[PDB]
DNA sequence: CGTTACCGCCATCAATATCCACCTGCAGATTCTACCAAAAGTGTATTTGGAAACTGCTCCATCAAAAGGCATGTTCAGCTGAATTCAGCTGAACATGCCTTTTGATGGAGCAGTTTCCAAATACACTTTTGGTAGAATCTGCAGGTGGATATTGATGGCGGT
DNA sequence: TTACCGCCATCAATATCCACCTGCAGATTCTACCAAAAGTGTATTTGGAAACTGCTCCATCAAAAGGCATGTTCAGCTGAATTCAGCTGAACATGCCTTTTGATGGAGCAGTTTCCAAATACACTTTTGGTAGAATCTGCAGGTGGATATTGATGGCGGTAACG
């Protein structure tokens, strides 16, 4: 077949479509779900996208305030806790 | 000669037990990294990301997804069902108040 | 001569708790017994969560406490779950639970 | 190379009284540190707000005792209050 | 004109380009040397891309939109053939093809054409002239003569005698015959013959398109070769009345009147095979031959002002003057259907209204027992109608048996059928003890089983076991002779084989509504011309 | 005898109560229950009238919100009648139960 | 003071019905009411205690509406119009 | 003789919010422009909420703003609803909303 | 009697500016006061946390601006930031 | 009434992967010594915040009455919730192909540590303006009752098709 | 050729909307006094902006690999269709207790004064916790033999129905 470069050259799948079908399947199965509708995944993908701008933007709002262009895990923890989604283990 | 085939549901429950007894991350590292990078460049370009920040955000993401999926399972069971469909997600996010 | 934690029969540092209270801008003045009382409360909470985690590890045939054991200990205690109902444990997972309708026959 | 304060050796020390033959991992130890910090922050904030509401300019053992009674569930709160009172009495008689 | 086509053709190319980044590999010419193995030109004889399409549409090499569509479809075919199926390139090609289909139809429909899909016929199995019972499966090498005679691998060594040596062209079974084009005399435009329903017999003067007909304010001449003009028979009239009454009491808004005609009826005889002839006939236990009457039927509907055939029939009727056990029996040899009936929901029920209507007819004549073989055709096999549509699902044995049972339950509710059962229960019902006691029908599965087993009182238990394996497949219906209808000789459709041969020769297929209407009108013309001659 | 079909009067009074804001709980039984609960917590306790009114109004608002959630959850289950599993699921998803 | 008992029944069936209707509920099963009462009780058990817990912290014996605002705010049920 | 409230072109009190910030023990030091920023933000929020309340009152043929109008204004704006998602309004009621299936299904 | 501070008159002028002929009731006015005060402690706590994160002992307009972006959603956030920036510039221009 | 063959249920066995512990190298956890800025403990003078003591005083608890907006109990049938059946079909399980993912190594964009120093923040004493607010007077949007024109529901007359 | 369910048409019994009119608690306008703020004006102090720079670690890129993406067939799913015992809604009679207006003893909240134990601010000495390097120990992650445990397939036996 067709050769050439391939590694990191075929990011073709859209940004949110980066998460694979079996990945969302595994996330649903861990929640005790045993059967998934075919068109659930993309919707959850959209839901996932929403969560991102719930936290990342706020974390970005932290990072720009500290005169930093590199985001830290402490910024992420503060952004998570400010929405009531406290995370432990990354406060060091 | 019609080889062995598990009935639908046995393997599902088995792997559900497997993943509930385990704690490893399920989302692959590279696609999630690309997603985070792209949605960050949506807000601010030329950003750099710490490995610890990325892994913390990822872990929070699988926690949020597993919680919403458990709520979705409860919602699907609530309507005398076993399969999840979009209105279950909608009801879960509505009761959570995000929508 | 004697540290405040030793004088109060506690293992957590009373002086560090007092310093953190002072630096947190919570109040202009902090009482003498407040850091002792808070250190005692923290020590009790740590001791009981560690006891439950060790019990879970022993039930799991393990002698080292892992975040999975901490999650099992916290979620299996009703009041600990209530206290940490809005707290996410890293690398902890969820309790094994299958609903009745999902079960076969 | 600034000193990063953490309750680490203290909590591990507490482990020695509760499980002499049981260890702890680094990730779980950071979990322990974050838990202790969060509980401390909650208790301190509740004590501060109780002090502010009553026009009280000093935070004593009574204020944080009330904070623990508000935040911590029933028998956990009772045990925490009892051990805090015992520690305060021991410190006073020290 | 080059500029004339652009305003319509360009949006499809823009939509193809809009697919990002799946369409990127197709934007530029694919260089065999650049991407690796240089065998691209060896496999793909004529490489082309999207840039070549843009250049052709700019300069104006395209004269008709069909050239543009053919080039796009040939691009898709090249991409599918060269690249492997599981490759992402194949998936991108399929997605681009789907995007092209979901816009090409209205665009070129605005230009006066009917549809913009390159239609290729179904992979239908070919028959053999020598053995008469051998078919050529898919992905199998065969030998063809003038695309008219076919021989398989086994039949090459079976024929005695070569009757030049290097005169038959070696071919492969991947060839799909293109659709024929007819040109309007007044306009000169060539377009597919099927969508215009133009036949050389009805209109020998020439072909006139709808645009030219509307230009002169004149309509096409009436067609006297319709299903309603076919001779009427008592059984056909009965079935027509039954279907019309059912559709009238249903009162479906989309329902249309259905015409049923019997175009063939002839007396034949079935001869006992050598094994049973030697074992029973010579001993005098059973006669050598069984006489019967075979009757062939079709069902038609008036859709869009055009006759369309949607149901077929082949039956064998052993009357009261036939030696037992075949006396007063009817056997359904083959039946076929086309699912373009309107409305769809009543369609299935309408089929019952035929079969039940048949059972009510012979019951009045004196026939007491009916025999049905629920054997659905395999993949690629067509019973009566040629090239069933790809979206026509072939019923499974279980579903087909449930359908048969359902009509029989409805008939019993209608008092027409006394009862129905499987063949083993009938064998218990008459205490079968010899192979002769079983009915003997031409082309039936049981005569072949008996022959093979004789080649293999053992007969009784053997045949009972064979009843046990395939009892649910075969239905025996107990209901409880002078036939009013005369004999109708028709060599064209006498047997499904000649009809299938005619359909294959003239490409009279049923893959689409327009193709099915063209086939139905072709058979109407052929039947109206065979009776005269 | 004139009788409306089941649901017409229900919709009428639902609109009536959605256009009104007055408290639907009488003050006295709620105050008595609050006194009982406080006495179980601490005896010899006194209540401001404003505190009782605030308790009652907050409880009414919380019940209205949980009833919105319960109704929409019942709509999810292709039903128009609420049965305690709706309230249980709503409270569980809200985090008040699990 | 007299020890009041069994006043959860004071939240009458029509009252629970009215609160459900204000929530847009159209049909109520027979076993809804008492269930809500228990949930109602739980909510009071969630708030009153905390408000009561405020009272002795001020060395008072009367519960004020301001401590009510404090408890509702600390339980994520912030209320307006009664101070704070 | 110019106050800091009028100096910033604001209606809300700069000095009062500065004093409240100092009294709240939020930080050991408070910037000079901090009370000005608080006054501007609070005045803006009050401005839009009062404008929406007045629009709701006009929609109800009322010239006096009532808590029902406040609830109508807050819940009809997605941003204000998100801002006050965990706040219950006194005597405000709820938005008129009946689900589809609850309507007659003739 | 001890003075009970409130924002009655300032919100009254705001209402007059946005609606000269529209009044306010006492209960709704209390709702307005409670809302503004609640916004006050929310923004103050956010600014204090921002000061604590960077070890900053002084809260300036920039910290409050960041906290506003954290708290206020979208168009409200940008408009409040613009209005506050204009007010700060006017204050520092005198 | 007798005999036999079908259908259903139960006993019995081939096979797969999901377990189990055992075993071994090892990243990671634990133990000990040394150094030491950073806290931590002790001493002494200063300040002050809140305890006690009495009392002014607001509203919190408690008892009286009455009549009417609703709580409580009963009926019936309208119809929504619950149980049963079955057919289209969407997902589950699985073999096939290979590719995107994972791990390790390597330049410099900025994250942090050090130092100067100045615009900017407390601290406080007067001084002036101004926001709570007792008190009396006038204004005013709408609570509440009345009446009748305007929607909303339901099934009554009869025409009609299944 | 008598009864039954829909429909589009009118019509009668009701809840809704609303304009109108009157009493009045509440909203808005002044007069006045005012302690608590607001703010300008110096002295003092320090938070952090600015400039230079060592040290991370983050983006980029190489190959090795344990996974994921499609197609096939089918047991089970979900929902449409049907039927029905049953209940909760509408109506109504009866009356329970509400709902507010009223007054009153006094427990208790809060203001004012005095004043001492405790918190604070340094100043000093001491243990001590966090980090870096060595080295011994070790719980448990890949393989791997092993008993065992589950489950769908198949054959055999008995119940039963049907024909003679």
Author numbering:
A (entry chain B): 11 to 102
B (entry chain A): 36 to 134
C (entry chain G): 14 to 118
D (entry chain H), I (entry chain D): 28 to 121
E (entry chain K): 1050 to 1212, 1227 to 1519, 1578 to 1601, 1612 to 1664
F (entry chain E): 38 to 135
G (entry chain F): 19 to 102
H (entry chain C): 14 to 119
Text taken from the publication that reported this structure:
We determined the complex structures in which HAT is directed toward H3NT (p300H3-I·H4acNuc) or H2ANT (p300H2A·H4acNuc). In all complexes, as in p300H2B·H4acNuc, bromodomain of p300BRPH bound to H4K12ac of H4NTac, but the position of binding to the nucleosome was different for each. In p300H3-I·H4acNuc and p300H3-II·H4acNuc, it interacted with the minor groove at SHL + 1. Importantly, in all structures except p300H2B·H4acNuc, HAT of p300BRPH interacted with DNA through one or two basic patches. Along with that, another basic patch (KN basic patch) interacted with the linker DNA in p300H3-I·H4acNuc, suggesting an acetylation mechanism for H3NT that is less dependent on pre-acetylation of H4NT. This interaction mechanism explains why H3NT closest to the linker DNA is more likely to be acetylated indiscriminately. In p300H3-I·H4acNuc, the density of H3NT toward HAT could be modeled for the C-terminal residues after G33 (leftmost panel). Since the distance between the substrate-binding pocket of HAT and G33 is ~21 Å, p300BRPH of this complex is assumed to acetylate from the N-terminal side of H3 up to K23.
